[PDB]
């Protein structure tokens with residue numbers, strides 16, 4: 463089997479991407495944030511504290527003839543911005559782009575933090591990291607991909623995120639029309655539960671490539687590109703007036719700037735992030751200071767190849783017995 467679903471930016475800055483997901487019988491369609499940096503599929507629901515729901519579409523398990531309470535199971539998770547959610551668990555039928563999994567753990571939110579409430583466009587998360595990170599207790603549950611994998615034509619999914627435009631998540635096949643040149647594959651460590659890999663270096667604009675190992679995660683659920691302070695300083699030094707602002711929380715730059723590209727290495731291959739992809743717009747409405755899309759990972763504890771990087775590539779998440787990651791230009 464295979465599946466194919468369009469993923470769409472939630473706003474004009476590509477702050478996140480949502481993908482429609484069918485849950486239950488009859489189908490209830492929710493728009494979920496596919497997150498290769500976590501392993502829980504959770505949704506706003508009829509159980510979510512009413513004052514914490516503001517415009518999201520909710521899953522109502524009592525209206526699904528295939529929903530079953532997973533007795534005794536609870537979940538609780540936090541995210542990189544300090545947001546969090548928690549609740550109980552149902553199993554139900556879940557379909558993505560025509561690919562169906564029966565008995566998928568659907569984690570129903572009883573509580574969500576303010577940032578989730580405040581974002582009416584995201585109805586929940588669909589985790590695509592390794593199932594070892596799943597937070598359901600006392601019996602850990604599998605991701606949608608892990609549950610689907612045995613049925614898939616090939617044990618892979620691909621992320622093809624758009625810049626200010628829709629893109630595609632495919633399951634079970636590689637669309638050879640969706641990229642240019644060849645796909646370069648690179649080793650993955652699953653030891654921390656992430657799609658963790660090592661970039662071979664970087665370049666800023668038309669500058670020379672610096673060969674250096676950068677260990678990080680391929681994370682569709684993180685908006686920006688987080689890299690070591692040395693690398694990020696080298697990038698922003700090429701932008702007149704750019705500076706790190708403690709008050710804003712990262713590098714900012716004059717909105718009048720033309721940003722240089724940023725290249726990262728995948729083995730002997732190179733992925734070029736156009737400068738425009740690194741502009742996240744005014745820090746507040748009407749400001750002439752703009753927020754940068756490349757930020758320091760210092761204090762995070764890990765480097766993160768988030769959407770800024772991934773959207774410049776066609777990315778293969780190869781879930782074979784020994785997982786790997788593939789990157790192609792597009």
Ligand SMILES: N=C(N)SCc1ccccc1Cl
Nearest residue numbers: 499500541542681683684762
């Ligand atoms: N993608 C996620 N759900 S968490 C990504 C992340 C953010 C900040 C610090 C660590 C991580 Cl893994």
